[PDB]
Amino acid sequence: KPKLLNKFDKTIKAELDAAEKLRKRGKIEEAVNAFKELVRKYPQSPRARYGKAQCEDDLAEKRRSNEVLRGAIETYQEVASLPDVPADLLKLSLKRRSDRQQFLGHMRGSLLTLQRLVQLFPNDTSLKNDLGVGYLLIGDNDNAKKVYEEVLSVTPNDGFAKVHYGFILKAQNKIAESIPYLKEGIESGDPGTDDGRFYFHLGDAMQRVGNKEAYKWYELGHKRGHFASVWQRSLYNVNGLKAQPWWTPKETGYTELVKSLERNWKLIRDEGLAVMDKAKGLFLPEDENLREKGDWSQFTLWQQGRRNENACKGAPKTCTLLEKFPETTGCRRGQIKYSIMHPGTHVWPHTGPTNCRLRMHLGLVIPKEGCKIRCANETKTWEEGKVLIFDDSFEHEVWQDASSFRLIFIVDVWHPELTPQQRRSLPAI
């Protein structure tokens, strides 16, 4: 189907096919030497150059080598700099270049490549959609929003653009405005719209506005394989882990950690209160748009399994205590943090990102009435000096209607059924 051979390349098609046959047969080393010979003999051939890049790409996969892949990324760009490159080949080469740049985490480099593709092919709407993803990956929602507005101005029923536009609106707390874009985009069935993120945020947007249809989308997302259950909607999962909203210490196996937290809870409390009194700026407001109303801040000692040294200057005894427990300090998909919540606070129903952690709450200052936490269908309360444990990959919700502040200590642990091999290799969250 695609036209990849320019005038000269058609005259050397037999040599180009022989080299490509070696690549398809998995003889990568012979293939790179065949294409390097073609690039030597025909230095202007775009197909030979693209063959060299594809072989380096395959070699990077075989060796799991970032350095080899960086070579491929340069050769893909070289294809585009050659004379008389067929449009189909030019697009394929730069699209793979951007894709591999993103794989390596070169998000700035990928963005430049995507911008060049849109400049070269101004009528290709899918390339503009790819550029919007480039901005989303780097955290530039404003430019991403502009891109999808450009896409929807010419192709209003592009479902890929709709779900991404709706995602951005929702992330900007434009909850009502995001629902039709997310809903119409998923319903469009366009490639790229059957994605767990869009089911996740549509249902949540509906919940925030009181739309009872929300759980019909959770059930569908579960039916389509995006969620373990309609209750447990985390998207960064290891399949097969024991799934239940509430856990006892004995069930987790981390009874030594729990005993230490409960025996020593007052020192943890006292350091948290001292920061509240003398270093209040270390408590940072929650910034994930999870509050309907109220005040909620956190003072984080560990995140992604990394100790915050300056924070531990503010709670040195607590940090010294916790350092004995790698099941939490090494949990690279969790945090260790103080969490203060004040009256008038309602945290929206929401889900954490991963089923790979369990979340412990140690009560430090708990008002007698007005504070409670729901996980799945069960609501509980904290007690000073006592640990609660829940799987925050299940939907959970918090209320603070007391007449004074509520302070807890949050300690994430690896899910106990994750092997040591999984705990060292899982990407941090």
Partner: peptide
Amino acid sequence: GKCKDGLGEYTCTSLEGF
């Protein structure tokens, strides 16, 4: 930004190649 308590980011992990 990072997904700490929620799942609000487009991606919650950072790509580092192989």
